[PDB]
């Protein structure tokens, strides 16, 4: 049954939806379309229908589908299961925990199909650890998963998979290696692996990845992909305040070529995809050129992961678009995003419409430039945006209010849902052209069954009447209200 949003305002531009132990909000014909609408004024994925008409006339804005122009296939959408997300979720009563996970992972919720999992601690942990902290354990004999994995992350990831109808892909990323493998002997700061790729430090580090995949397999979890390192550029930066491990693109190239690729290929986990970069898109296309023009590294790289944080410095055509033109067979994937990280921003703005529009504007732009997936950061945080051992607080689509056993679903959650619920793995992006200049962001995709989905974000405050033309089925006449977001679905059969 469709239970509606319980709105609550916290003084910002829109409302959150209040969920608790007993209550959370939840969820065509032919010649007919469905519309799902979310507005700043408070509408939350509201369903409505309309006719696909045969003829159309007028000089209004027209968006024409080009279903014969086929682009990338979609891997999917989801978020990260950090220690911080696990702690917050486990601090609710079990019925409330089930409503939180169902929100994300079930068909009654928004159908996430990706989960990013940090390999040992990052800033969103309450302590500083790796899986092999015993000094000079080159053998990795004292390699083990702490309670953070065995009592927190793993059981939650299981509950998620149990609630999913869609098959879920796990993605793993390390922030730092054991400190005895690092030039600087610390989890943070400027510092990289000692020595040079091909050597004992590097074979050990590669072996750790396999050790990690082995331990997760023992608990019956398998990975779709790993990244070669979270934000390699970080550890190049003097003073870096939290867990990091620096690689120049050359160093990453040679690590993948001589150590990490071979070690994964020779393992039971040879089907695991390796993704490179896992950093700002401004580093593209340079990094892809350095890594992929080496045939010894190229043969191990399935794809390129990007983070959104310096987007403003890096227009998508010159970065994502140029990477696709040079390397069309190496998928681009967005693996981390969050709002509220800028020193001047308040970490959590409960009910922020603006932050929701940032998510959807990013997903659309990324999809228009060949990106196959998009992953949020922390699945849930507290009202302060934590916890986080260095107070690097940020926002999250779900905020958990522990002392009240309630959690808030923010507009980011819905802007995300507009994609994740209606764009399953295997969907494919198709062309869409606009009849004239406009302030909308729009993308069209084809489901595996051939049915259409179109998402329209209105970045301006003015209501925009428009028409969507599907070349051999008809016309959808609709209105896109100011600031709103719409998903349209229709069968082309
Ligand atoms: C979990 O959240 C739910 C939904 O928000 C809480 O229950 C709801 O409780 C509200 C008010 O407590 C209730 O309200 C209306 O009717 C009033 C009289 O006509 C009117 O003046 C008022 O403003 C409300 O519009 C609403 O009907 C109800 N929602 C549903 C569908 O249940 C729930 O609360 C607690 O559990 C039940 C038994 C509830 O009715 C309260 O009496 C309880 O204290 C939340 N749980 C907790 C722990 O807060
Ligand atoms: C500037 C980057 N801003 C960030 O904002 C927060 C987020 C970090 O939590 C994450 O661990 C990093 O990968 C990333 O750098 N993050």
Q: Fraction of residues in helices?
A: 10-25%
**Any idea how many domains?**
2
Number of strands: 21
User: What Rg do the Cα atoms give?
Assistant: 23 Å
Note the overall shape. globular
CATH hierarchy, class of the largest domain: Alpha Beta
Distance between the termini: 28 Å
> What characterizes the major β-sheet?
9 strands, mixed
Widest beta sheet: strand line-up: 4-3-21-18-17-16-5-19-20
The CATH homologous superfamily of the largest domain: Glycosidases
Quote the beta fraction. 25-35%
Please tell me the CATH architecture of the largest domain by its name. Alpha-Beta Barrel
CATH topology of the largest domain: TIM Barrel
Count helical runs. 10
Bound molecules: a molecule of 4 linked components (NAG-NAG-MAN-FUC), ligand LGS
SSE-based structural type: alpha/beta
PDB class: hydrolase
Keywords: glucocerebrosidase, hydrolase, gaucher disease, sphingolipid metabolism
Assembly: monomeric
Entry title: X-RAY structure of acid-beta-glucosidase with 5N,6O-(N'-(N-octyl)imino)nojirimycin in the active site
Give short descriptive properties of this protein:
monomer, 493 residues, alpha/beta, TIM Barrel, Immunoglobulin-like, nine-stranded mixed β-sheet, 25% helix, globular, binds a molecule of 4 linked components (NAG-NAG-MAN-FUC), binds ligand LGS, hydrolase
Can you offer a commentary on this structure?
25% of the residues lie in helices and 26% in strands. The protein has 493 residues and is α/β, with parallel strands linked by helices. It folds into 2 domains: 376 residues, Alpha-Beta Barrel (TIM Barrel), CATH 3.20.20.80; 109 residues, Immunoglobulin-like (Sandwich). Strands 4-3-21-18-17-16-5-19-20 form a 9-stranded mixed sheet, with helices on one face. The longest helix is centred in the middle third of the chain and has 19 residues. The site of ligand LGS has 11 residues, from loops.
